Design a protein around this nucleic acid. Structure first.
Ligand SMILES: [K+]
Ligand SMILES: [K+]
Ligand SMILES: [K+]
Ligand SMILES: [K+]
Ligand SMILES: [K+]
Ligand SMILES: [K+]
Ligand SMILES: [K+]
Ligand SMILES: [K+]
Ligand SMILES: [K+]
Ligand SMILES: [K+]
Ligand SMILES: [K+]
Ligand SMILES: [K+]
Ligand SMILES: [K+]
Ligand SMILES: [Mg+2]
Ligand SMILES: [Mg+2]
Ligand SMILES: [Mg+2]
Ligand SMILES: [Mg+2]
Ligand SMILES: [Mg+2]
Ligand SMILES: [Mg+2]
Ligand SMILES: [Mg+2]
Ligand SMILES: [Mg+2]
Ligand SMILES: [Mg+2]
Ligand SMILES: [Mg+2]
Ligand SMILES: [Mg+2]
Ligand SMILES: [Mg+2]
Ligand SMILES: [Mg+2]
Ligand SMILES: [Mg+2]
Ligand SMILES: [Mg+2]
Ligand SMILES: [Mg+2]
Ligand SMILES: [Mg+2]
Ligand SMILES: [Mg+2]
Ligand SMILES: [Mg+2]
Ligand SMILES: [Mg+2]
Ligand SMILES: [Mg+2]
Ligand SMILES: [Mg+2]
Ligand SMILES: [Mg+2]
Ligand SMILES: [Mg+2]
Ligand SMILES: [Mg+2]
Ligand SMILES: [Mg+2]
Ligand SMILES: [Mg+2]
Ligand SMILES: [Mg+2]
Ligand SMILES: [Mg+2]
Ligand SMILES: [Mg+2]
Ligand SMILES: [Mg+2]
Ligand SMILES: [Mg+2]
Ligand SMILES: [Mg+2]
Ligand SMILES: [Mg+2]
Ligand SMILES: [Mg+2]
Ligand SMILES: [Mg+2]
Ligand SMILES: [Mg+2]
Lengths: 94, 58, 78, 136
RNA sequence: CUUACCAACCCGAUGCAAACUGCGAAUACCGGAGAAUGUUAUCACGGGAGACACACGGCGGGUGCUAACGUCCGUCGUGAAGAGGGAAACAACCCAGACCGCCAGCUAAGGUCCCAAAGUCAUGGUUAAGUGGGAAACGAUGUGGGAAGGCCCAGACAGCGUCGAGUCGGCCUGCGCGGAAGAUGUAACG
RNA sequence: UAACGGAGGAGCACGAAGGUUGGCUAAUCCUGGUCGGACAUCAGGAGGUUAGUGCAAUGGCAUAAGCCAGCUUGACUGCGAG
RNA sequence: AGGUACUCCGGGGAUAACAGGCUGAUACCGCCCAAGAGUUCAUAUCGACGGCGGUGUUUGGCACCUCGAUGUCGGCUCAUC
RNA sequence: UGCCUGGCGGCCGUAGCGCGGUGGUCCCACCUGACCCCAUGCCGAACUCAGAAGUGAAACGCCGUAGCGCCGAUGGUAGUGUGGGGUCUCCCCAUGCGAGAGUAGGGAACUGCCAGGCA
């Protein structure tokens, strides 16, 4: 039931990622299977509320990116060192 | 072949020695001085090193 | 009071004298070292203090070889 | 008062304290007291906060200290001039960077852990925040 | 037999190190090649020296109290030996290198209400403290913004079953408030 | 690359502890074994240099630079590209 | 190898003693948390273990001003903030 | 040409351990003797010599198998050269370089020369 809307990233690296997080988004990566990895951006507030539910880390999620639906599992999460924020998430294709 | 125009926009007083040497290699002598150089990767690298104090007219 | 320290020895100016690709004459010292951090390869000798020196004229070449992944210095005839 | 039982060397360079912390997750209990600021924690401070924590939960549950004061600090005595060698070791500190989990608690309700950690934070020279275990 | 017990080893989990390293940059340095630019800026030899009390500022550090307009190194800048403009005044900060003349023009840092040259400029917000124009832990229905949550016409919250529309307290965040006592005279925006 | 900065050493030893040829491989523990014990010598196993290096520390060392033996005086004289 | 308070010359504020300055470890004065004392009761009054500041008043650190001279402790007189 | 084996190399853990299986015509190994060449600070254990009855048990080779070692992205993070900024013990912005660890995953080596056996 967990659905996440995302956009493909058009810029990567340190500067682009810090600009994302200064605009209330954050980067993430989808990998696994045989498809190439896909680098995406998520809205920080929406995902930070969802991941507070323990089932976020156990269920199969759906990431809607450019209309297409992708089934994934949360694999890794980088949290801010001391703020209640998210820096990055790894999603493995399910 | 193709050339570009480069103008010095800030002073060279107190810059790093490498930066002064780069302004010398471009032929720039004073604030507002404009030179015309061939457009090569070596020239572009010199502009990149002192890009904070020069401006390019393509 | 006073200190029980305050001693040191003179610096020995060890290290690499000729880097990879440099053209050298026979006899040229390539590296000064304590023990064989670098080992002698082709056309290179190892002195009594483990100095590596060129035995022929040519270009310095560093490489990792052998079962222990050891670093060797050789001279490529030019 | 924590302090290494023995050390290779008696005295240590002042050094600096840049960067973010390693060890930013509640790893042993369910609740933690996390550093938000940067600084030094003396062994006396670590112990004053431990005592306040422990008395608040009536010695129930379990408490972990995630930091250890392994850096010796020297001082020159009063009325002594500059020079004549490094001063004498006077106390021990732990270097704290933002994000460092300092204490952890388990076996008590969250409301009581919050109150116990509040009394402890009042003994510490660095700003802190209450954290809970996360599943990932 | 039992442990208030202590427990090494090993296994799993968590940190720390100038004198730890199964990893490992950026830069810097050595060498080669190529263009453009630079009054040979490079090297050698010879004639003449001065100098061997340095200072502050940035960055990386030892020492000291991550005290000193302190002290000791590394490296860059300026002063020294450098005027002009800015920082009220202020070698060492910011801008910038004065061959001479001009009652011409454009800019830099920094500025444009009056002292005092130039916007009492335009548009959208915030502050009510003269905050701006001195300071901490910590304290607080100050006020702006944001994302959630609880309860609620099946009548909430406050007041006293009544009453009829919102209410409650967390989180994050902008600006402000208290914390804040000194000596000739306002005297901590020149 | 400095400080009355932080830590340790030297003012020798060796005609073999030098040369060379041939050979060899450590610590520690476990088990069994006369006196014999925590620890002697023996046997097997685990281990893999955690040993060793004439003397500090660092860099080295298995092709050992570590251990053993035979023969020896190159611990030679004059020179020396670089 | 020593002494010089019987002393002397050339120099230095390149370098100490006084006072100023910078600093504020120390000192002094505030504050925060609240273990407890206070019959009960943390906060009438004290406030342990620890935390944060202010002053420039102590003991000090430094060696920037003065060594071609800026006279000392105390008393007296007169003060001023 | 294919299979198997021996020797000398390249390469230096994707190549090493462990576990399980498997091979003797040849080759290899153990093996059989030793007055001898030679050997044991004792011992034909080892070295050495003379051999070929036995066995693939050990060792070795080959095959299998992720319990390990090992290799390992993408993305993010740390650091950092230059220029600029702040609330300046520490950071932020523009630009360039960009780890380590960890994750997905990979993975039971590959190969040259000569020689012998077999088909
Ligand atoms: K400096
Ligand atoms: K100058
Ligand atoms: K004001
Ligand atoms: K010998
Ligand atoms: K010998
Ligand atoms: K005399
Ligand atoms: K006398
Ligand atoms: K103070
Ligand atoms: K002060
Ligand atoms: K106060
Ligand atoms: K004087
Ligand atoms: K008075
Ligand atoms: K393998
Ligand atoms: Mg950057
Ligand atoms: Mg040395
Ligand atoms: Mg450092
Ligand atoms: Mg070059
Ligand atoms: Mg001198
Ligand atoms: Mg000098
Ligand atoms: Mg100097
Ligand atoms: Mg500094
Ligand atoms: Mg310093
Ligand atoms: Mg100074
Ligand atoms: Mg300073
Ligand atoms: Mg002078
Ligand atoms: Mg000037
Ligand atoms: Mg001026
Ligand atoms: Mg002026
Ligand atoms: Mg104009
Ligand atoms: Mg005007
Ligand atoms: Mg004000
Ligand atoms: Mg305030
Ligand atoms: Mg007054
Ligand atoms: Mg120097
Ligand atoms: Mg020097
Ligand atoms: Mg030998
Ligand atoms: Mg020997
Ligand atoms: Mg007398
Ligand atoms: Mg005199
Ligand atoms: Mg004085
Ligand atoms: Mg004083
Ligand atoms: Mg002076
Ligand atoms: Mg000085
Ligand atoms: Mg004076
Ligand atoms: Mg005078
Ligand atoms: Mg006078
Ligand atoms: Mg035999
Ligand atoms: Mg077998
Ligand atoms: Mg990596
Ligand atoms: Mg295998």
């Amino acid at each position: 039931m967990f659905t996440i809307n995302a956009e493909v990233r058009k810029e990567q690296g340190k500067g682009a990622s810090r600009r994302l997080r200064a605009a209330n988004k954050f980067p993430a990566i989808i990998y696994g299977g045989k498809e190439a990895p896909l680098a995406i951006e998520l809205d920080h507030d929406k995902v930070m509320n969802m991941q507070a539910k323990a089932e976020f880390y156990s269920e199969v999620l759906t990431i809607v990116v450019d209309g297409k639906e992708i089934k994934v599992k949360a694999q890794d999460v980088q949290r801010h060192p001391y703020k209640p924020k998210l820096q990055h998430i790894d999603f493995v294709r399910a | 072949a193709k050339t570009i125009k480069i103008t010095q926009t800030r002073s060279a007083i107190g810059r790093l020695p490498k930066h002064k040497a780069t302004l010398l290699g471009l032929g720039l002598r004073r604030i507002g001085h404009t030179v015309e150089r061939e457009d090569t990767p070596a020239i572009r690298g010199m502009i990149n090193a002192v890009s904070f104090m020069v401006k390019v007219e393509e | 009071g006073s200190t029980r320290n305050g001693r040191d020895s003179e610096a020995k100016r060890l290290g690499v004298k000729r880097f990879g690709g440099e053209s050298v004459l026979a006899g040229s010292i390539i590296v000064r070292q304590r023990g064989t951090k670098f080992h002698a390869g082709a056309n290179v000798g190892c002195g009594r203090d483990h100095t590596l020196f060129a035995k022929a004229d040519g270009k310095v070449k560093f490489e990792v070889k052998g079962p222990k992944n050891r670093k060797f210095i050789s001279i490529e005839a030019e | 008062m924590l302090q290494p039982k023995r050390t290779k060397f008696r005295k240590m360079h002042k050094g600096r304290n840049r960067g973010l912390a390693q060890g930013t997750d509640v790893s042993f209990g369910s609740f933690g007291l996390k550093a938000v600021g940067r600084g030094r924690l003396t062994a006396r401070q670590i112990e004053a906060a431990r005592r306040a924590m422990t008395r608040a939960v009536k010695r129930q549950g379990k408490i972990w200290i995630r930091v250890f004061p392994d850096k010796p600090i020297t001082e020159k005595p009063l009325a002594v001039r500059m020079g004549k060698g490094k001063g004498n070791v006077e106390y021990w500190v732990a270097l704290i960077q933002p994000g460092k989990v300092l204490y952890e608690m388990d076996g008590v309700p969250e409301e009581l852990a919050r109150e116990a950690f509040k009394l402890a934070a009042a003994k510490l020279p660095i700003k802190t925040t209450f954290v809970t275990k996360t599943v990932m």
